[PDB]
Amino acid sequence: LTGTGVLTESNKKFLPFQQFGRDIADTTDAVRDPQTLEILDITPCSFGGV
Amino acid sequence: YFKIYSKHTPINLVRDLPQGFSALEPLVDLPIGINITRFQTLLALH
Ligand SMILES: *[C@@H]1O[C@H](CO)[C@@H](O)[C@H](O)[C@H]1NC(C)=O
């Protein structure tokens, strides 16, 4: 699962059966890490017009 | 895929099934590929 974004701590209690979450759009909002099993929040990197 | 969902909840109505809502989450998923057509439960003989 690839993407770009800021990974921060989160307080969304994933239940034991879900591994990754998706937006209203078909893209990841947060993910569970392998090896250490933790929940990383994904917030899109800043962008904008010039 | 044989998907198993389950939930334990208190109940207080023996005439029918108590009113309310609860969704059951998956626990086990076995890729057996067996044509399953019937099932039965097992009770402890006493
Ligand atoms: C990967 O390594 C970490 C480091 O201790 C360990 O806790 C974890 O259990 C390992 N992964 C699995 C799937 O066991």
Swiss-Prot record, chain A:
* Stated role: Attaches the virion to the cell membrane by interacting with host receptor, initiating the infection. The major receptor is host ACE2. When S2/S2' has been cleaved, binding to the receptor triggers direct fusion at the cell membrane. When S2/S2' has not been cleaved, binding to the receptor results in internalization of the virus by endocytosis using host TFRC and GRM2 and leading to fusion of the virion membrane with the host endosomal membrane. Alternatively, may use NRP1/NRP2 and integrin as entry receptors.
**Quaternary structure annotation from Swiss-Prot or TrEMBL:** Binds to host ACE2. RBD also interacts with the N-linked glycan on 'Asn-90' of ACE2. Cleavage of S generates a polybasic C-terminal sequence on S1 that binds to host Neuropilin-1 (NRP1) and Neuropilin-2 (NRP2) receptors. Interacts with host integrin alpha-5/beta-1 (ITGA5:ITGB1) and with ACE2 in complex with integrin alpha-5/beta-1 (ITGA5:ITGB1). May interact via cytoplasmic c-terminus with M protein. May interact (via N-terminus) with host bilirubin and biliverdin, thereby preventing antibody binding to the SARS-CoV-2 spike NTD via an allosteric mechanism.
Protein's UniProt name:
Spike protein S1
What range of the full-length protein does this chain span? 546 to 595 of 1273
